[PDB]
């Protein structure tokens, strides 16, 4: 820890160091929105009841699947006022803005991966 049970499409990534975290501010930056949402969900589930996290997360799921196709930039106008970051500009949009992506994948491959078919 998985065995094999196309290398040109995905290659040149040794197994050595993905199970070896980089500079300690790695798991607190690669996964930040997920961790903040998890903490808020746990707090609400503990103090307010079991209805609020279920309702809010299923609202997230409902609003998530109306954006443009993955191979184009997503405006994400909605889901933002609902998340609570409506005006909380920070080190997430001014640095390496995804609109000007330096590298871009194939459309069919990206959409079929987003669907999870692969």
């Amino acid at each position: 820890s998985p065995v094999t049970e196309d290398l040109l499409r995905k290659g040149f990534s040794c197994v050595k160091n993905e199970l070896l975290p980089s500079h300690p501010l790695e798991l607190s930056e690669k996964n930040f929105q997920l961790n903040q949402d998890k903490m808020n969900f746990s707090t609400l589930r503990n103090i307010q009841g079991l209805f609020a996290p279920l309702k809010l997360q299923m609202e997230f799921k409902a609003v998530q699947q109306v954006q443009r196709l993955p191979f184009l930039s997503s405006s994400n106008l909605s889901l933002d006022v609902l998340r609570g970051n409506d005006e909380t500009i920070g080190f997430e949009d001014i640095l390496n803005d995804p609109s000007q992506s330096e590298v871009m994948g194939e459309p069919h491959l990206m959409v079929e991966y987003k669907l999870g078919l692969l």
């Binding site: 040109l8 290659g11 040149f12 990534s13 040794c14 050595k16 160091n17 993905e18």
Partner: protein, 197 residues
């Protein structure tokens, strides 16, 4: 370790090599062609850490044929160099402590030949004659001394022969025989191997 040199000229990108293998204290094989081929006009020399060299060269070689087969025409040496450097930098910095040296070649149809020198941190120069390995130290001065700005194809072989004789006489290791290939506006020509009895 190993040895790679390439001399420029008016219409050729002549490169030598060192057909040899490596191990702990043993020579597994005495003829191992290091010269991967890119297209009908481009070579790619590569010496580095074992395994990573033959993997990176294979990956970067089954990517230039795709461009030709998908667009009809062929790449240019400058584009090939600026693509190989980018791939090497992105992959080396990503997750792998690589150690590979490269020496591109090639002859386009607009500006003479072109020879590119690249270290293991993914730099890109355009020296008229470069070298790799450890023999670079003992042979680069010899290459620089006699290198007239214009050299005939006949004299290039003689200069290479002298530069390899000096290395074979004053070096610790036992590089027994070398390979020679010269590129012109006719494909990838070949010459008889250089073997020292």
């Amino acid at each position: 370790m190993e040895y790679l040199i390439g001399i420029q000229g008016p219409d050729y990108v002549l490169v030598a090599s060192d057909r040899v293998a490596a191990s702990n204290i043993v020579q597994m094989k005495d003829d191992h062609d290091k010269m991967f081929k890119m297209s009908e006009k481009i070579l790619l020399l590569c010496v580095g850490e074992a395994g990573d060299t033959v993997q990176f060269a294979e990956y970067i070689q089954k990517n230039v044929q795709l461009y030709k087969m998908r667009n009809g025409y062929e790449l240019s040496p400058t584009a090939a160099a600026n693509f190989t450097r980018r791939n090497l930098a992105d992959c080396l910095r990503s997750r792998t402590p690589y150690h590979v040296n490269l020496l591109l070649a090639g002859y386009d149809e607009h500006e003479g030949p072109a020879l590119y020198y690249m270290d293991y941190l993914a730099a890109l120069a355009k020296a008229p004659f470069a070298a790799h390995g450890y023999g670079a130290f003992l042979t680069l001065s010899i290459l620089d001394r006699y290198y007239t700005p214009t050299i005939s194809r006949e004299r290039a072989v003689e200069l290479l022969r002298k530069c390899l004789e000096e290395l074979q006489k004053r070096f610790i290791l036992n590089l027994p025989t070398f390979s020679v290939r010269i590129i012109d506006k006719n494909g990838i020509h070949d010459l008889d191997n250089i073997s020292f009895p």
